[PDB]
């Protein structure tokens, strides 16, 4: 929801499913996948920074 | 013991059956 929040994912096809990651971008411009999140570890394409929607976006405290 | 029968059946199934069966299957590709 907010920038910089540590966020676990709930979409089973991501490489980072059930792994927390830091929110880079939150866009408020009707984008279906507005929240650009990057990570510590890296998938097979060499690309940690991906993006997600709000339903697949669980913050922690 | 009809000993002459392999001298008939072993060629007519060993070679000429995979000639005409090549014809039947391979024309049967186009039928």
């Amino acid at each position: 929801i907010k920038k910089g929040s540590l966020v676990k994912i709930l979409r089973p096809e991501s490489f980072w499913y059930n792994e927390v990651g830091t929110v880079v971008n939150v866009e408020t411009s009707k984008v279906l996948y507005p929240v650009l999140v990057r990570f510590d570890k890296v998938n097979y394409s060499g690309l940690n920074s991906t993006n997600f929607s709000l339903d697949e976006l669980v913050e922690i405290k | 013991s009809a000993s002459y029968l392999p001298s008939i059946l072993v060629p007519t199934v060993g070679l000429i059956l995979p000639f005409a069966s090549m014809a039947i299957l391979f024309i049967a590709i186009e039928k």
């Binding site: 096809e13 991501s14 490489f15 866009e27 411009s29 009707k30 984008v31 279906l32 996948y33 507005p34 394409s45 690309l47 991906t50 993006n51 997600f52 | -």
Partner: protein
């Protein structure tokens, strides 16, 4: 023909079209992303299916998926 389907992860960064050596994929103005772009695959009759798009598809997991369908003359890519 190799059915190329382009899902809604397609943030329109055009490495698919610039990566495809067949112009089966173009870019379509689609007001659903930040860049306003989303690729399309109209001419999948020319689609080889070499999956050079899915190499250079920097989405989360593969907005553009190339399903290996039928094999015509052009989709087999034979020279003669």
């Amino acid at each position: 023909a190799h059915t190329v389907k382009i899902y809604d992860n397609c943030i329109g960064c055009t490495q698919c079209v610039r990566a495809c050596p067949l112009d089966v994929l173009e870019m379509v103005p689609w007001d659903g992303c930040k860049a306003g772009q989303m690729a399309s695959a109209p001419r999948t009759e020319d689609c080889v299916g070499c999956k050079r798009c899915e190499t250079a598809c920097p989405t989360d997991f593969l907005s553009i998926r190339v399903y290996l369908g039928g094999e015509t003359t052009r989709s087999m890519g034979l020279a003669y």
